[PDB]
Structure formats: structure tokens, C-alpha cells
Amino acid sequence: HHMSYTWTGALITPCAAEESKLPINALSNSLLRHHNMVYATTSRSAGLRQKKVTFDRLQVLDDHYRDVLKEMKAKASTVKAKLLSVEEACKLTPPHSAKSKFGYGAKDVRNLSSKAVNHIHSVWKDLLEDTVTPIDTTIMAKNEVFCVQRKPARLIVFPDLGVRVCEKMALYDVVSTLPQVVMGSSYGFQYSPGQRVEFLVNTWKSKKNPMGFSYDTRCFDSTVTENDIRVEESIYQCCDLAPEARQAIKSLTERLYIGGPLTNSKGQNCGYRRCRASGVLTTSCGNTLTCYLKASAACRAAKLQDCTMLVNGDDLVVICESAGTQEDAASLRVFTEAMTRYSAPPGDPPQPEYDLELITSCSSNVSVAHDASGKRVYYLTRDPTTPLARAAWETARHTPVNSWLGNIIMYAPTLWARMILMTHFFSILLAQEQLEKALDCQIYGACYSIEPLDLPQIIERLHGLSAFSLHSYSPGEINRVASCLRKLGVPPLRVWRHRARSVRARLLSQGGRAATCGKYLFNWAVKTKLKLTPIPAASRLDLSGWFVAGYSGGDIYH
Ligand SMILES: C[C@@H]1C[C@H](C)CN(C(=O)c2cc(Br)ccc2NC(=O)CCC(=O)O)C1
Ligand code: NI
Numbered sequence: 171h172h173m174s175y176t177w178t179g180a181l182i183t184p185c186a187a188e189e190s191k192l193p194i195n196a197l198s199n200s201l202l203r204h205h206n207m208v209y210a211t212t213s214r215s216a217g218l219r220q221k222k223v224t225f226d227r228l229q230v231l232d233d234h235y236r237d238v239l240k241e242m243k244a245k246a247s248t249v250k251a252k253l254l255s256v257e258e259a260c261k262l263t264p265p266h267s268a269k270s271k272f273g274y275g276a277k278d279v280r281n282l283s284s285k286a287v288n289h290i291h292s293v294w295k296d297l298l299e300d301t302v303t304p305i306d307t308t309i310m311a312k313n314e315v316f317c318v319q320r321k322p323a324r325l326i327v328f329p330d331l332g333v334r335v336c337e338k339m340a341l342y343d344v345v346s347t348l349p350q351v352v353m354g355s356s357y358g359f360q361y362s363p364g365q366r367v368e369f370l371v372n373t374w375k376s377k378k379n380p381m382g383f384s385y386d387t388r389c390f391d392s393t394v395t396e397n398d399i400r401v402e403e404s405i406y407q408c409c410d411l412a413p414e415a416r417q418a419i420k421s422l423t424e425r426l427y428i429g430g431p432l433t434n435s436k437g438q439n440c441g442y443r444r445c446r447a448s449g450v451l452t453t454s455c456g457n458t459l460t461c462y463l464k465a466s467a468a469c470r471a472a473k474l475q476d477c478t479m480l481v482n483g484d485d486l487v488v489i490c491e492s493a494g495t496q497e498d499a500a501s502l503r504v505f506t507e508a509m510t511r512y513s514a515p516p517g518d519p520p521q522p523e524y525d526l527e528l529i530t531s532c533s534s535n536v537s538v539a540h541d542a543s544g545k546r547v548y549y550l551t552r553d554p555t556t557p558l559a560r561a562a563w564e565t566a567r568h569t570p571v572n573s574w575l576g577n578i579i580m581y582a583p584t585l586w587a588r589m590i591l592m593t594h595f596f597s598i599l600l601a602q603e604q605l606e607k608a609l610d611c612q613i614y615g616a617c618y619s620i621e622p623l624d625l626p627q628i629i630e631r632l633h634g635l636s637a638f639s640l641h642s643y644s645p646g647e648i649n650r651v652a653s654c655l656r657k658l659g660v661p662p663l664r665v666w667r668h669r670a671r672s673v674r675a676r677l678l679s680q681g682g683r684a685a686t687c688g689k690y691l692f693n694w695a696v697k698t699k700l701k702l703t704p705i706p707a708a709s710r711l712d713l714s715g716w717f718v719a720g721y722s723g724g725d726i727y728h
């Protein structure tokens with residue numbers, strides 16, 4: 171058997187006390203009344219996830235697969251990648267990333283303390299000298315917030331801190347550089363949300379009769395086989411690399427990436443992994459390469475015409491030429507059969523779509539609004555259910571990752587981000603005078619320390635000034651927002667408009683950066699608008715590294 175996991179029977183254990191029910195404070199009801207709709211996942215449901223992720227994988231590899239791989243390797247050979255120093259690798263480590271089993275923490279790593287740096291050096295030497303001994307990993311249940319309809323906790327699998335820094339030294343430059351070179355415009359993590367909409371729309375516009383579909387692989391990490399993971403290393407090895415980097419990548423593949431022993435928080439042996447570790451540097455890059463490889467081959471197998479893929483890890487969308495409605499449904503059944511043969515069967519079956527705004531990829535869809543001139547403007551949005559469940563949790567609880575800040579960055583142009591999220595959280599931050607306190611959030615899986623007072627500069631830079639003037643959202647978009655609010659017990663959009671006028675007035679009264687936030691962020695709320703001009707600070711905003719690559723699970727801080 172080629173099983174994704176084997177289990178001893180030891181439980182997946184928490185390392186802290188876990189909350190499942192929505193924490194409520196005095197601010198909760200101003201956002202959300204249906205508190206019972208909102209939950210966090212815990213280790214109590216881990217067993218249910220273990221049944222989902224444990225299965226036998228079969229893989230039949232044909233000539234389309236090897237043809238695509240050979241083309242990918244040829245592009246990969248043009249990549250020259252650098253070895254990071256220990257010091258460079260250390261500054262990429264999140265301030266609150268899990269501490270070592272070996273007497274030092276993430277703060278120690280970032281300060282380049284001699285004890286951390288000495289141990290990292292010893293893990294590095296061990297990797298160069300030993301290419302066989304499985305590396306230990308911890309298995310944990312993630313605590314994640316959702317609206318009902320309950321999901322079981324996702325699992326996270328990660329090596330010790332010293333190993334994680336070693337992954338960066340060996341491979342940070344590779345996973346940041348290689349996928350765009352190999353996949354070109356198909357690599358999703360190179361785009362901002364607006365660069366993504368322009369690619370999707372331009373691609374849709376370059377087909378006589380466009381057809382698109384998203385493809386949902388059931389448990390993508392568990393579908394990743396030893397072959398798949400060895401193929402990724404052969405792709406990494408195509409790069410021009412230093413001899414120490416080649417040996418470290420070989421060693422990390424053999425000892426960590428291919429599989430290893432699973433240990434709970436209590437130190438007990440839980441089992442063994444033979445699939446993708448969800449918490450290593452190469453998770454995002456490995457997943458994107460494996461998904462693009464299999465999908466590219468599956469496109470050729472199905473005889474899909476003029477195929478453009480967009481791939482973000484395990485998230486896949488294809489836009490192609492329609493050969494007619496019946497040949498489309500048929501070609502999708504063959505694409506799906508090919509994918510299955512390659513060990514990537516679907517969860518939901520793929521559906522062909524003939525309207526761009528109806529395809530969901532990366533939990534997002536294109537939509538249309540109008541700028542300050544009446545022009546039709548395409549922008550990225552999503553169903554706000556999960557953004558709003560998480561915002562409710564963050565209303566009453568301090569969390570490591572402020573999802574609301576990251577959702578405002580990613581979805582600033584949206585009706586729901588501007589009306590609810592900006593209104594709610596600027597109002598909370600005004601009341602606490604915490605406007606200039608930097609908060610952690612994540613974009614494409616990497617962690618960023620961000621001042622909420624810098625939001626005007628940031629939004630202009632990523633989305634343009636039009637994000638501050640959009641209006642006349644589509645009916646379907648308005649109805650999905652309004653309907654989500656009713657479900658969660660959120661006050662309707664008229665209440666938020668009334669609240670934003672208050673919040674705006676309050677911000678301008680602070681002067682300076684707060685006034686800029688009031689001026690730019692809430693101009694949609696007043697009838698007598700202000701003159702919104704390019705912000706000098708935005709020009710100078712150092713936004714390098716932001717949408718280059720994906721590092722979900724990769725333990726990255728910028
Ligand atoms: C769909 C919302 C319903 C709410 C009651 C009012 N309303 C807004 O205040 C609004 C919010 C943002 Br953010 C941007 C524009 C808004 N107003 C409009 O789109 C009004 C119609 C228009 O200008 O075409 C729109
Ligand atoms: Ni061939």
C-alpha cells in the first residue's frame with residue numbers, strides 16, 4: 171500500500187487551551203448577532219480529519235505527463251538561485267513562530283543569538299553529512315474560524331525551528347524565483363488582486379468562445395506522492411545552485427519532504443507521513459508545481475483548446491476555447507479522469523462556465539463596479555461569510571494573524587470591505603487610540619507587520635485611486651453581500667453608511683495620517699465628496715516582495 175498516513179493511535183493533542191465558541195464582548199453585537207453561526211475548529215475533531223486525509227494513492231504516468239515535466243525542467247535550467255546565510259534566513263522568521271525543542275525561540279533566531287545560530291549551523295552540517303535519517307515533525311490541529319454550513323480541524327505538520335531556517339538557507343531563493351520562470355503568467359502568486367483580474371479578463375478576452383472552470387482536488391496534500399515530491403527535487407536541481415545547496419535540497423527531500431515520523435505536542439508518536447507536509451517551505455511551491463504539471467498534462471489528454479491555466483498552490487482555474495457546450499462537458503470528464511490517474515481526483519466535480527464572474531478561484535471571483543467617471547471597472551471580490559466570521563472573532567479576541575487587516579489589503583475595492591470592515595475596525599481603533607500600532611497579517615501565506623494608518627498609501631499602490639471611488643456594484647454582488655449579513659445577523663448596509671459618516675468625521679478630527687484615512691477610506695460615505703489626489707507617501711512605499719511568491723505553511727516574515 172501507498173498510504174498517505176499510518177497511525178499508531180496516539181491522539182493529536184493541543185498545546186494550549188482551545189476555544190470553539192465565539193468569544194463575545196461589548197463590541198460583538200455591533201457587528202454580528204447570530205453568535206452561534208460562528209465557531210473555531212479544535213483538536214477534538216482531528217480524528218475526523220485523519221479519516222479524510224488517510225487513503226491509498228495510485229499513479230499512472232503517461233507521455234503527456236513526461237512531456238510537460240521535460241518542458242518544466244528546461245525552463246527550470248534557466249534559474250540561478252542563491253544560498254542564504256544563517257543571518258539572512260533568521261530575519262525571515264516570524265517573531266511568534268514556534269520555538270525550538272533545543273532551548274531557543276523565534277525571538278532568539280531573529281536577534282541572531284549565538285545559541286540559535288550555533289544550533290542552526292549544526293542542523294546544516296547534519297543535512298550535508300546525512301541524507302537518509304527521517305527528520306522529526308510535529309502534527310497539530312489548526313484553530314480556524316468559519317461560519318456553519320462544522321468542518322473538522324485542518325492538520326499542520328512542521329519540523330523543528332532549526333530545520334525551518336535551514337530550509338530557507340537552502341531554498342528560499344528557489345521557491346521565490348523558480349515557479350514564475352517555469353510557469354510564466356500561469357503562476358498566480360506573482361499578481362496583486364488587480365493584476366489577477368487583468369490576467370483573468372485579458373485571457374477570457376483572448377478566446378473567440380471562452381470557457382473556464384475551476385478544479386477542486388480532494389485533499390491535495392494527501393494526494394501528493396513520493397514520486398511527485400522526487401519530481402519536484404529534480405526540478406529544483408535543474409537550477410544553477412551552489413554545491414552545498416544541492417546537497418541540502420537532496421537531504422531535505424529524502425529526510426523531510428518525502429515523509430517522516432509524526433509527533434504530538436505531548437511527545438508521543440502519532441504515526442508516519444508519506445505525503446506533503448503542510449508546514450514546510452516548499453509546500454506552496456511544491457503544490458503549485460505538482461498541480462501545474464498534472465493539470466497541464468490533463469489538458470493535453472482532454473484535447474482542450476488554447477488552454478491558459480492559473481495556478482495558486484492546489485488552486486486551479488483553466489480558461490480555454492469552447493468546442494461547443496457538449497464537447498466541453500465531455501472534455502472535462504476526460505481532464506478529470508486524467509487528473510485522477512495522476513493522483514488528483516476532484517472533491518467537487520468541475521463545471522464548465524461561460525460567464526467569467528461566475529468562476530471561483532482562490533475563493534474569489536471577478537466583478538464589476540464603476541469609477542468616478544462612470545467607466546466599468548473589474549476588481550476582485552469574494553463571499554464575505556468567512557471574512558465576517560473571523561472579524562467577529564477578532565472583535566473580542568487578540569489573535570496572531572489579523573485577518574481583517576489582510577482582507578482590507580486584498581479586497582479594498584469591495585462593497586463589503588469598505589462598508590463593514592473599514593468602518594468596524596477603524597471605529598474600534600479610534601476608541602482605543604491604537605491607530606498607529608502595527609498589526610500582523612498574512613498575504614499569500616507570508617507575515618507582514620502593517621500600520622493601519624498606512625492603509626491609504628497601501629491601497630492606492632495596490633489597487634489605484636479608483637478603489638476609493640467605486641460605486642454601482644452589480645446586483646448579484648450586492649445581493650450576495652446583503653444576504654450574507656442576514657445569515658450572520660450583521661446590521662444591513664444602511665447602518666454601516668450611517669456609522670462610516672461618524673467614523674470618517676472622527677478620523678479627520680485627529681489630523682495627520684488619521685485624517686488621510688478619514689478623507690480617502692470613507693469618501694464613499696458622504697454626499698459632498700473631497701478631492702482625492704495621489705499620496706506622496708504612496709510613491710515612496712517600499713512594497714517589494716509583496717506579490718512575488720506563495721509561502722503558505724512556509725514560516726515566512728517580511
Ligand atoms: C449597495 C449599497 C447599499 C447601501 C445602503 C448604500 N451604498 C453605499 O453607501 C455605497 C458604499 C460604497 Br463602499 C460605495 C458606493 C456606495 N453607493 C452607491 O453605489 C450608490 C449608487 C451609485 O452611486 O451608483 C451602496
Ligand atoms: Ni509526446
